[PDB]
Design a protein around this nucleic acid. Structure first.
Lengths: 141, 58, 76
RNA sequence: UGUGGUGGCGAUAGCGAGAAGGAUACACCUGUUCCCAUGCCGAACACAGAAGUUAAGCUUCUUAGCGCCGAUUGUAGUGAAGGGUUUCCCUUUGUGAGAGUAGGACGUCGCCACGC
RNA sequence: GGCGGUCGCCUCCUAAAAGGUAACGGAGGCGCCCAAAGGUUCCCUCAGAAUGGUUGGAAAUCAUUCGAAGAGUGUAAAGGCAGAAGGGAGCUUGACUGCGAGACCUACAAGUCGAGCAGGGACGAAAGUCGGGCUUAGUGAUCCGGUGGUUCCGCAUGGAAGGGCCAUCGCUCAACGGAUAAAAGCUACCCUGGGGAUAACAGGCUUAUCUCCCCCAAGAGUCCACAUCGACGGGGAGGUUUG
RNA sequence: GAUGGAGGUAGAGCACUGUUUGGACUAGUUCAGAUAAACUCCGAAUGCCAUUCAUUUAUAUCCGGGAGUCAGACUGCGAGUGAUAAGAUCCGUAGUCGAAAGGGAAACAGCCCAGACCACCAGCUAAGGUCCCAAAAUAUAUGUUAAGUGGAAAAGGAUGUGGGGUUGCACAGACAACUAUCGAGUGACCCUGCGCCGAAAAUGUACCGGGGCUAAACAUAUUACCGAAGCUGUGGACUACACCAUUA
C-alpha cells in the first residue's frame, strides 16, 4: 500500500469530482496505456492488486509506470455510535480519478503480452477503461 | 421606433427582478399589451423577459 | 467530544465609499490590515491602517506604479 | 550638437555578452595641518588639494541567450432559458479565460548649465 | 436525559471573488510584556553557498565572490513591510492637558478611526514629525466601600456630622450583559399539570453491517485454472441480523 | 442600459509552501510527469458600491396610534457533518406550501400549468393529450425494435439486427469440404442506433390506472383538433382615478 509520508492536515473534505482529467491524458514514458473512461475513487489496495497482476504476467520483466498516487485520506466512524461529535478517525487513502486519465504504462514487450497484462489489471478496478498507444507527434521513436 | 409587447406567460414561479421588469413596462395580466419606444434600455428589458413575451417591431 | 469550536467576531473590513462618489471631510474610505491600498492626494492613514479623507471631493481608486493601488480625493 | 545636473512615465526603461572614449565636465588618484570621524583602522564619512590615468564607475554604440509587454481562434468555466438518471451528464442563447503562440522590444517625453 | 466536554475575547479554513452567514464542523492563541522593546534625528542592510585559514571539529570567530528576501518583525495566525514597520548610535518623556468637524459598526448599552483649534513642550539647521509599541487579543454595567482635590450644599443662625461634583483604587462576579452578602443530595414510596415539541417494542425510510448470488483468475488439484476448492481485488439482489 | 471601481471564488498553474513518479547525473544540479480546504506567477461569468447620466415605472424617507411572529416543510441549485446513506442533519440562494380554489401527474400539502367579485346550455388557448373506459387524428412522410423491450437494476458475457469506416486474401482461381474436384467471393479489425442474458420474498394478477396494443412502441420532421374558475364576448355589484355641465 502506498502512503504519503508526513501529511500537513489529518482530515479533509471529499468532493466534488465532476469529471474531466486535468493532467496526464497521453502516454509519457511507455508504449501502451490504460485510460479510464469513468470517474471514481481508487484506493491503495486496488492499485497494488492491479500492479501485482500486471507484473506477474510479464516474465522477462519489461517496465511498468504507476501514474496515480493516493494523496487524500478517508475517515469513518463505528457501528453503534449516534450522529454528533467530530469527524471519525482516518482509515484509508485514495486518489480521485476523472475520465481521460491514463493510469499505467508498460514497455519492453510486444503487443499481446502488454495487451493481456492491461486486460488483467482492469478487472481489479472500479472503472471502465481503454487501451491506448503513443500515436503521432514530431517524434515517437 | 416602437414595439408592441404582449404578455403571454404568467409571473407565478418566476424570480423578483423578472416580476419587477414586467411591472416597469406596465404589463398587468395575460394577453395585455403595451407600446414603447425603441431604446437600448427597453431592449434590455425585453431581453430579460424574452421567454415570457412576444415582440413585434411596430 | 471535540476540542475545536471557537471563532472571533467578524470585523467588516473592505471599501466604505465607491469610486466616483462625492464625500465630506473625514469620511472613511477603506478598512484593512496593513497597506493593501496606499494613501494618495488628500488622504490620511489611521492607527490601524484605515484610510480617510482630509478634504471634500470625489474618490478615485488608481494604480501606483506596477503593483500597488492608491486612493485620492479631488475637490471640484 | 556633446557633456554635467535634476524630473515625469507599469523593466517595451532591466540583466548578461561586446566595442569605443577624456574638449570642458564626471571620476579614480594624492594627503592629513585645520571643522568632523573609526564601537580597531582618514576604509568610510570630513576637509586640504591637482602629480598621475582612462584600468574601474560614467557616456555612446552592437547583440533578442535571461527577464519584461504580448494579440488572433480554439478550448475550460459560467447569466438566462430547457431535457435524461438526477452521483453526474446534454442542448440552445449570451459572455469567456489560464496555457500555448504570431508579433513588440536594447526606452520615450521635459527643464537648467556649460562647451562646439 | 445522565456521564464526558463547553460557556468571555483574538486569528485562519468552512463562506458560494462586497459585507454578513450554522453544526457536540477542521486547526491555533489570550487573561500580558517593555523606562526602552516608547518619541525624534542621523546612519545601516538580511538568510544561506562556494573558496582558502593554527588550535577548531560539518558547524564559534576572519577575507572574497554569487545571493529580492529563501531572514527579521516581544508574543497565535493572517494581511503588510528591503524609499523599511527590519538593524545600530545621540538627545529626551507626546505612554501631554482641554477638545473635536465628519465617518465606520450597531436592537440597546458599548466598540473603532479622525483632519483641525488652544495651552505648554521633545527632537531637528530646517521642512517637519510626536495624544505609546507593523496591524488586529491582554478584559467586567450598576449598587456599595477606600484614598486625594474642590470658588458646590449643609433642615432657626454660625459651625460640624453628612452628602454632591472631579481623579483614581477594591472582581477566575471565568455560568465572563454579572439572581442573593450568603446554598448539596435521595425517592422502588411517591403526587399534580403538560408533550408523540422527546427516549423503548411494531410500522416507515436507509442498507454501512448481515445472509445470499456473481466477475477476474494467481494457485491447489501427480499432469491439468474451471470434477471439486478459488488468494489479492471488483459488481449486485434481499429486507429475517447488529445498527 | 452606459461608464468607472473594490474583491481572489469557478477554472488552470506549479513562481511560493505541503504531497509525489521516472531519468541523467555527483559532493562525496538537471530533463521530463502529476496534486491541494486552510498552496497561488494568474484569473471569469454573475452578484455588490456609485453617477447633477438615459428610458419606462410608482414608490422611498420622517413623526405618531394598534398588532401579530421568534416549532417551519419540501423541490432546483452549492457546501459542511454522514458511508459524497436517509422523507437524515446544519447553513446559503430561488420557488411553491403555510395563508391558494381551478387543469395535468390513477389516487397525492410542497412537482408542471395557472391566482376564484358574480350570472350564461357562447368563443380562444396553457401544461398535458386524441383505439374503448373518457373530450379530441385508428393523422401525413421516412426509418428502427420482436424484447410485451416500451411498462424498475450493475460489473461482465454473446456469429441478435441497422448505419458509417480501415484493410488482408480472391478468374496467372480464392475460404469450406472431401483423395493421397469446385466455379464467388472470403477473413480480421474500429466508432455507432436499437434490442438479449445477468434478474429469487412472503393475503391475489400486483409499477402499463384497466381493457387491450406489433403499433395504440421508439426516432426525425409537418399540420389539425381537444383541453382550466387563465384570456375574450354580453350583463350586473362595489371601490379608486381621470373625464364631465351644477346635477357626481
Amino acid at each position: 500500500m502506498l502512503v504519503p509520508k508526513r501529511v500537513k492536515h489529518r482530515r479533509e473534505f471529499r468532493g466534488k469530482m465532476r469529471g474531466e482529467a486535468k493532467g496526464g491524458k497521453e502516454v509519457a514514458f511507455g508504449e501502451w496505456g490504460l485510460q479510464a473512461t469513468e470517474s471514481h475513487w481508487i484506493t491503495n489496495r486496488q492499485i497494488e492488486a492491479a500492479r501485482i497482476a500486471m507484473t506477474r504476467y510479464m516474465k522477462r520483466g519489461g517496465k511498468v509506470w504507476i501514474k496515480i498516487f493516493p494523496h487524500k485520506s478517508y475517515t469513518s466512524k463505528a457501528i453503534g455510535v449516534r450522529m454528533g461529535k467530530g469527524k471519525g478517525a482516518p482509515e484509508g487513502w485514495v486518489s480521485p480519478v476523472k475520465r481521460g486519465k491514463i493510469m499505467f504504462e508498460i514497455a519492453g514487450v510486444p503487443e499481446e503480452v502488454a495487451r493481456e497484462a492491461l486486460r488483467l489489471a482492469s478487472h481489479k478496478l472500479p472503472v471502465k477503461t481503454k487501451i491506448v498507444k503513443r500515436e503521432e507527434m514530431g517524434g515517437e521513436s | 421606433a416602437e414595439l408592441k409587447i404582449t404578455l403571454k406567460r404568467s409571473v407565478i414561479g418566476r424570480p423578483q427582478n423578472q416580476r419587477a421588469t414586467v411591472k416597469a413596462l406596465g404589463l398587468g395580466k395575460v394577453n395585455s399589451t403595451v407600446t414603447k419606444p425603441a431604446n437600448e434600455a427597453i431592449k434590455g428589458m425585453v431581453n430579460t423577459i424574452s421567454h415570457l413575451v412576444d415582440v413585434e417591431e411596430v | 467530544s471535540t476540542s475545536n469550536g471557537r471563532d472571533s467576531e467578524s470585523k467588516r473590513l473592505g471599501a466604505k465609499s465607491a469610486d466616483g462618489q462625492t464625500v465630506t471631510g473625514g469620511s472613511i474610505l477603506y478598512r484593512q490590515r496593513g497597506t493593501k491600498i496606499y494613501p494618495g492626494v488628500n488622504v490620511g492613514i489611521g492607527g490601524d491602517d484605515t484610510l480617510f479623507a482630509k478634504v471634500d471631493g470625489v474618490v478615485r481608486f488608481e494604480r501606483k506604479g506596477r503593483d500597488k493601488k492608491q486612493v485620492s480625493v479631488y475637490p471640484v
